[PDB]
Amino acid sequence: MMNPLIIKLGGVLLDSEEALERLFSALVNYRESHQRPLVIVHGGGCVVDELMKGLNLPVKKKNGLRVTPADQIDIITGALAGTANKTLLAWAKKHQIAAVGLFLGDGDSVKVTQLDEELGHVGLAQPGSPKLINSLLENGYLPVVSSIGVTDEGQLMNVNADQAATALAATLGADLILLSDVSGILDGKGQRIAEMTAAKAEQLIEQGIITDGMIVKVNAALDAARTLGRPVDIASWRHAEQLPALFNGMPMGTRILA
Amino acid sequence: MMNPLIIKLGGVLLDSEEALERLFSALVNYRESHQRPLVIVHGGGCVVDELMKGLNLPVKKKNGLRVTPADQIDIITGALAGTANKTLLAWAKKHQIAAVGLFLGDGDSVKVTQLDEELGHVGLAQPGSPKLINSLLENGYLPVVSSIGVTDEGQLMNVNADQAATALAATLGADLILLSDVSGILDGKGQRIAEMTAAKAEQLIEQGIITDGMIVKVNAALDAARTLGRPVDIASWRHAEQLPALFNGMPMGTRILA
Numbered sequence A, B: 001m002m003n004p005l006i007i008k009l010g011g012v013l014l015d016s017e018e019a020l021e022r023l024f025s026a027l028v029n030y031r032e033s034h035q036r037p038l039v040i041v042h043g044g045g046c047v048v049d050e051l052m053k054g055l056n057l058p059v060k061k062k063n064g065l066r067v068t069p070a071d072q073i074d075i076i077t078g079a080l081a082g083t084a085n086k087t088l089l090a091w092a093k094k095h096q097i098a099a100v101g102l103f104l105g106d107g108d109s110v111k112v113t114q115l116d117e118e119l120g121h122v123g124l125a126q127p128g129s130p131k132l133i134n135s136l137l138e139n140g141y142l143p144v145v146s147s148i149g150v151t152d153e154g155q156l157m158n159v160n161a162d163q164a165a166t167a168l169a170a171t172l173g174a175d176l177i178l179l180s181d182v183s184g185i186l187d188g189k190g191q192r193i194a195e196m197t198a199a200k201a202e203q204l205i206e207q208g209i210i211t212d213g214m215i216v217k218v219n220a221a222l223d224a225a226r227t228l229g230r231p232v233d234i235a236s237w238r239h240a241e242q243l244p245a246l247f248n249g250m251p252m253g254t255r256i257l258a
């Protein structure tokens, strides 16, 4: 079987039924015209944000990663591993796709450990075992993986979805496409940056252009690029007309160079 | 491979770390002393109840089944398919059990359709395909299945966990044990009823002894009993000393006769 293709979803995508429909239309088209098996990895995006906002719970970040107190891991796991994951599975079913929902701990696909006590239940994702997912792909299923994980001691961990995607890409030796609200990484004028290298990323970070989770996202993409030995794309899920070509390789956002 | 054994969990079990530890201890012991593969099916129990109570959301029932409005299916799916499911997966990991979390729609294990428009997003569970779960069992995994499902049109459905367990038992041709807060079905004096037949169940329901979801639970157990052609047990998860023998066959609650 070929190296799979991981398409990572997140942001406010789940807030738009229209965007979800156009996305799944493109997913079905990709599947029915390619031999490379697909794998979806997703974060919490608007599902978690809106819930937290509704529960009047603050969202604080420390170096791009949002602090996840022990008294909130259950509700976040619910919104991320539960609501977001199952909503995506429902869209897959609606489009006659046989999908299987998983989280990072299933089949020890991605190994997770506590990243920093100051962050609480935030996990550090590293490559795991590709056996379970490889078996699902062989059997014709579309794995849909949430960014929640668990330590060997049984503690639930909230993992940055981009870092989770990169860790799974390494695990599966898969190509990777990170879909976000914006068209890749933006420069100081808010314009799309076509190509990215570690050297340029360092400069942009130094200049304050790349900040917050974007630092985590770019570093993750760069990590995947060097590990896989090939480019990783960061692009938008907003423009339907662009999805088919993007999935097939047309550069629509920021190409992270290995 | 042998007919698997489904152990259904629910109630306030997840509110007790002690009960969860003693349960998983018994699960590990069962696994390491039996060739029959285990499968866990679970409901939302206290996880959903406490969340709803906290969100000041009412919990209304109609014939034992709780009404699930469209504006609540997402949060319930989160608590049930997300929090409850992953908490159980965390306990499994903690006990070195290789488990895989699933919901009713994965591999179309259990087919779900809307039960009644008056109930909202409440699903009717019927036998599905045993292929996915059979493959996981063959590969050495412990499937942990939540009672959330999805219709072919992509609508998420909240399914009574006992009915979900029975539907999966039929699907897999599995033995079944339903664990609850109380020791089986209680009579008018609140005493345990050792054995149950359809005839006796009809009488107890007529007398107002069996009510609410217990009507759903007993009817579900009776349905499984007649379909499988063998007895189904309803017992408690509260007394640790009783678990090992129960899992091996000792009658500790109410045995539903086929």
Ligand SMILES: Nc1ncnc2c1ncn2[C@@H]1O[C@H](COP(=O)(O)OP(=O)(O)O)[C@@H](O)[C@H]1O
Residues within 6 Å of the ligand: A010, A011, A012, A045, A179, A180, A181, A182, A184, A185, A186, A187, A209, A210, A211, A212, A213, A214
């Ligand atoms: N240089 C940058 N280029 C692009 N986005 C950036 C940059 N610096 C910070 N960001 C922030 O990163 C956000 C996207 O990352 P994130 O919030 O994690 O959501 P997502 O990946 O789903 O789009 C943008 O909405 C923006 O606010």
Ligand SMILES: Nc1ncnc2c1ncn2[C@@H]1O[C@H](COP(=O)(O)OP(=O)(O)O)[C@@H](O)[C@H]1O
Residues within 6 Å of the ligand: B010, B011, B012, B045, B179, B180, B181, B182, B184, B185, B186, B187, B209, B210, B211, B212, B213, B214
């Ligand atoms: N005849 C009966 N025997 C036993 N339990 C009954 C009976 N009639 C009603 N019940 C109700 O059923 C409850 C158990 O079912 P349920 O609430 O669905 O939780 P669970 O199955 O996790 O124990 C008991 O707590 C009791 O309030």
